[PDB]
């Protein structure tokens, strides 16, 4: 056998009694350094996951405490670290700043501003590795988290305190779902209702810096940064930073949750945090498992995603919705990390490339999408229209094979095909054009009552637009009634009937 601290330098020190002038309790000497992993001798009083600081100004996290040495993962390039360096304890587990002083600021995995807008306020700090809530603090998910997307709000409802999952392939629209969700919250944040405001956190793990810069420009254009934090852990960042960034975001959001406010955190992309952790584990010589991932990679994501809760009024009532994004490779939802996170979360928005190019953008594939919360996370009006819409779409999906033939089939199948095509053309949405819930319910109500069975499918996307502009301009009282009331009252139902008929009465 052999140890890594049995090198002849340490033994030389210890033979001639030179090991008493060195403080091996709060300082250590690097034995090895390579591929971002340092092996340090000493630091006998160092805690697991504690942050140590190297002589050359770098930081590191001490992960592997073995009898001989400490395995530190360096937070940057190991160019500056040389064998024999001096590593000092910091004394505290890694923590990040939190507060409303972060809103509108781009930060890195450790809370340092990287947008060059000046120091970061940072009144309070919070440890990233904090246990999630328990059984008792939570209460069932009841409030809706308005995504602003017709498909997601109609057929895959997302509540507050829920862990959805935007799972899809490459270049299908996942980041677009996330950004539309972030941008749609301006109508609530601008207003005065203090229990509808949602604060957004966007964790960008492993994306190149140009992508994040364009994303920040997009948010600024939509004036949606004043309530957004962006935590960047881009590709050039060391593996430990990509590994921590989800936890920094989750703690910056747990701050809002603990104080009665509501937050939305979008871990984009989790399949890259898994890769960074895989790197760190393999370089620390930890035993690999399936696909070379460490054994505790389910633990890594579960202890992160189980912090998305809906606290009860005895704790504040705040909440932290989570929208982890995962990129499946071909369609393989049976791979390792997709499997883990599908078994961890509460639903999934499954995106397609067949649907993306068939013209159905957003490419949300209903039937594979699910929300185990469901109607509990919908408003009464949205429930009323979405029950029928979902039933009709389900009927349409089992006779969609005949869609090509269509004719030479009974009248019931013809009607199913026609209604399904109209509904699918209805769920189509632009980009960065979310819609208030009243708009969505008006449009879907028009669709699902047959008032479009006469229009040609190619004209439904133009109808939707013109009708929506009409109602938004002429009829604000009805929309306001539906919004504030939350339901479709009989008088409001009659008003919607007359409006839809009058606009459709002449459309051409």
């Amino acid at each position: 056998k052999t140890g890594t601290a049995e090198v002849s330098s340490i033994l030389e020190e210890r033979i001639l009694g030179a090991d008493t002038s060195v403080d091996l309790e709060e300082t250590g000497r690097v034995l090895s350094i390579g591929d971002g992993i340092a092996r340090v001798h000493g630091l006998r009083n160092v805690q697991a996951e504690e942050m140590v600081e190297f002589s050359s100004g770098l930081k590191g996290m001490s992960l592997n405490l073995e009898p001989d040495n400490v395995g530190v993962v360096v937070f940057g390039n190991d160019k500056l670290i040389k064998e024999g360096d001096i590593v000092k304890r910091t004394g505290a587990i890694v923590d990040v700043p939190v507060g409303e002083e972060l809103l509108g600021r781009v930060v890195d995995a450790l809370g340092n501003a990287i947008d060059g807008k000046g120091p970061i306020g940072s009144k309070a700090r919070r440890r990233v590795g904090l246990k999630a809530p328990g059984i008792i603090p939570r209460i069932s998910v009841r409030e809706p988290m308005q995504t602003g997307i017709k498909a997601v709000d109609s057929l895959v409802p997302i509540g507050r305190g829920q862990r959805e999952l935007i799972i899809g392939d490459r270049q299908t629209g996942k980041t677009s779902i996330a950004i539309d969700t972030i941008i749609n919250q301006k109508r609530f944040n601008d207003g005065t209702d203090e229990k509808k405001k949602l604060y957004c956190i966007y964790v960008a793990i492993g994306q190149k810096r140009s992508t994040v810069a364009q994303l920040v420009k997009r948010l600024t254009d939509a004036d949606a940064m004043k309530y957004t934090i962006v935590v960047s852990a881009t590709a050039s960042d060391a593996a430990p930073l990509q590994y921590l960034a989800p936890y920094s975001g989750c703690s910056m959001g747990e701050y809002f949750r603990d104080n009665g406010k509501h937050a939305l955190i979008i871990y984009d992309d989790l399949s890259k945090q898994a890769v960074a952790y895989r790197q760190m584990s393999l370089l620390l010589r930890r035993p690999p498992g399936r696909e070379a991932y460490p054994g505790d990679v389910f633990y890594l994501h579960s202890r992160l995603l189980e912090r998305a809760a809906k606290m009860n009024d005895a704790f504040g009532g705040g909440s932290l919705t989570a929208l982890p994004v995962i990129e499946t490779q071909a369609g393989d939802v049976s791979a390792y990390i997709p499997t883990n996170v599908i078994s961890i979360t509460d639903g999934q928005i499954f995106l397609e490339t067949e649907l993306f190019y068939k013209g159905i953008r957003p490419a949300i594939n209903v039937g594979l999408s699910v929300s185990r919360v469901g109607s509990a996370a919908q408003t009464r009006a949205m429930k009323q229209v979405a029950g029928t819409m979902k039933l009709e779409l389900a009927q349409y999906r089992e006779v969609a094979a005949f869609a090509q033939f269509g004719s030479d089939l009974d009248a019931a199948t013809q009607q199913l095909l026609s209604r399904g095509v109209r509904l699918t053309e209805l769920l189509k949405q632009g980009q960065y054009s979310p819609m208030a819930i009243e708009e969505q319910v008006a449009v879907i109500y028009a669709g699902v009552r047959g008032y479009l069975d006469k229009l040609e499918p190619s004209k439904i996307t133009k109808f939707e637009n013109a009708f929506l502009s009409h109602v938004i301009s002429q009829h604000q009282a009805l929309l306001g009634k539906i919004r504030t009331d939350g339901k479709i009252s009989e008088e409001s139902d009659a008003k919607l009937k007359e409006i839809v008929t009058n606009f459709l009465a002449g459309f051409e």
Binding site: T4, V7, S8, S9, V30, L31, S32, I33, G34, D35, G36, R39, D78, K79, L80, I81, K82, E83, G84, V106, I114, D115, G116, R170, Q171, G206, Q207, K208, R209, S210, V212, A213, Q214, K217, S232, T234, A235, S236, D237, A238, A239, K272, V275, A276, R278, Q279, L282, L283, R285, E291, A292, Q329, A330, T353, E354, Y357, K358, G359, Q404, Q431
Partner: protein, 469 residues
């Protein structure tokens, strides 16, 4: 400082230092070699030993050979004097033309630009290729990828781009050939000399070449990309000017990294890849960027092992690119060249607010018709074409016309096809596809559209086909 080789295993050399160690990434020079062998430090193993990867053959090394420590990473000559030359990873010239006489040497390892330097502006780069311009338009200052297996057209397409963009491009240009056939390196050298971008007489050369071809040991292939990237970075910053940067392939960088990882003591990852695949690729692809001080248009050819787009290397590379053009073998078998897959290619600027509503709508109509054609092909395998709804046959006819019309003859593929190269301005491509979709050509036969430039050439080819009928 002076050290001493203590082990040689393959391309990995362990060097022991009695004085202070050299920092990681430093270049060390082996003493006693007829040529120049440069090792690069990769790890500190303790007991004063440092592991290193050799940038050249480690044959004839003797346990005990003295080694010098240069004190800095590999420093290459940079400046306007490198234009028209060729270089190794370590910067020495391999064009048999004399020393590169510069005043600036740049280290090949540097930190990536910070977030406060990113440009956020995008404007289409018109390349003159119908499929690229229509469905996956490029962008000035953006990073382009050319995925595809072996034998699909990566090299031909990249040569075509050099022919078009580089020839009529005011700024400079750089070509880093990473782990590719040396025959192709020589062919490019001579083609460039003929065209005139490389001028051996005057000082008017517009291209600097760096070559790390596939006869080199893994250490040199893993670093020639950084050498070319350093030349491009200097031209971006100090010259303060536009630059192009072509790389072929950027999969050999990853692969060369994988050929030494096991010997450096790292456990392998998913499929015989190094554990540091994503980090190693990111620390390189993050210096190929358009900062606010300059602008690099980067075109990268990316080998996809066995056409598998889900392999870890191409899969990871996908996230570092603005535009991608996934060349497909299933389309190259059909004779459609370039074999760019219209449904598997994407661009960031492909939005109605960047290109325009006409361009965007034409592109989306083409993609939708091709996807519908794919859906129909399953039915035609059972019914037959004779049994389709008289509307479906219209979709199939339009889809086949559009499939053929995306093919185009290059000026560099004259030898293969024998045809003549065509450059199609963007408006002409948009008009052609808008007309083909609108039905203004549903009488001309399919083959009229095969390997032609603008649509009028298809009309003329159909006229000729009819006359000699």
């Amino acid at each position: 400082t002076t050290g001493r080789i203590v082990a040689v295993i393959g391309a990995v050399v362990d060097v022991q230092f009695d004085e202070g160690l050299p920092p990681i990434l430093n270049a060390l020079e082996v003493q006693g070699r007829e040529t120049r062998l440069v090792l690069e430090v990769a790890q500190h193993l303790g007991e004063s030993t440092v592991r290193t990867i050799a940038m050249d053959g480690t044959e004839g090394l003797v346990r005990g050979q003295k080694v010098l420590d240069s004190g800095a990473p590999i420093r290459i000559p940079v400046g306007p004097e490198t234009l028209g030359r060729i270089m190794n990873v370590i910067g020495e010239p391999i064009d048999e033309r004399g020393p590169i006489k510069t005043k600036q040497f740049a280290a090949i390892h540097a930190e990536a630009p910070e977030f406060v330097e990113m440009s956020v502006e995008q404007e289409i780069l018109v390349t003159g290729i119908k499929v690229v311009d229509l469905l996956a338009p490029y962008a000035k200052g953006g990073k382009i990828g050319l995925f595809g297996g072996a034998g699909v057209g990566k090299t031909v397409l990249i040569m075509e781009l050099i022919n078009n963009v580089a020839k009529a491009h005011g700024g400079y240009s750089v070509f880093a050939g990473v782990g590719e056939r040396t025959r192709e390196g020589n062919d490019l050298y001579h083609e460039m000399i003929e065209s005139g971008v490389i001028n051996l007489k005057d000082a008017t050369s517009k291209v600097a070449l760096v070559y790390g071809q596939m006869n080199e040991p893994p250490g040199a292939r893993a670093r020639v990309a950084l050498t070319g990237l350093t030349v491009a970075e200097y031209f971006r910053d100090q010259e303060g000017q536009d630059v192009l940067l072509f790389i072929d392939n950027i999969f050999r960088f990853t692969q060369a990294g994988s050929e030494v990882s096991a010997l450096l003591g790292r456990i392998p990852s998913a499929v015989g890849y190094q554990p540091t695949l994503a980090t190693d690729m990111g620390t390189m692809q993050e210096r190929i960027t358009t900062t606010k001080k300059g602008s690099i248009t980067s075109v990268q050819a990316i080998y996809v092992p066995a056409d598998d787009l889900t392999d870890p290397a191409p899969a990871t590379t996908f996230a570092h690119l603005d535009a991608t053009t996934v060349l497909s073998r299933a389309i190259a078998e059909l004779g459609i060249y370039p074999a760019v897959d219209p449904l598997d290619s994407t661009s960031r600027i492909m939005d109605p607010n960047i290109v325009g509503s006409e361009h965007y709508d034409v592109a989306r109509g083409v993609q939708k018709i091709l996807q519908d054609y794919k859906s129909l092909q399953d039915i035609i395998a059972i019914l037959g074409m004779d049994e389709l709804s008289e509307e479906d046959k219209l979709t199939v006819s339009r889809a086949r016309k559009i499939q053929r019309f995306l093919s185009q003859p290059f000026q560099v593929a004259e030898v293969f096809t024998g045809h003549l190269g065509k450059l199609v301005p963007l408006k002409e491509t948009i008009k052609g596809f808008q007309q083909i979709l609108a039905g203004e050509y549903d009488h001309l036969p399919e083959q009229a559209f095969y390997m032609v430039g603008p649509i009028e050439e298809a009309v003329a080819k159909a006229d000729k086909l009819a006359e000699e009928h």
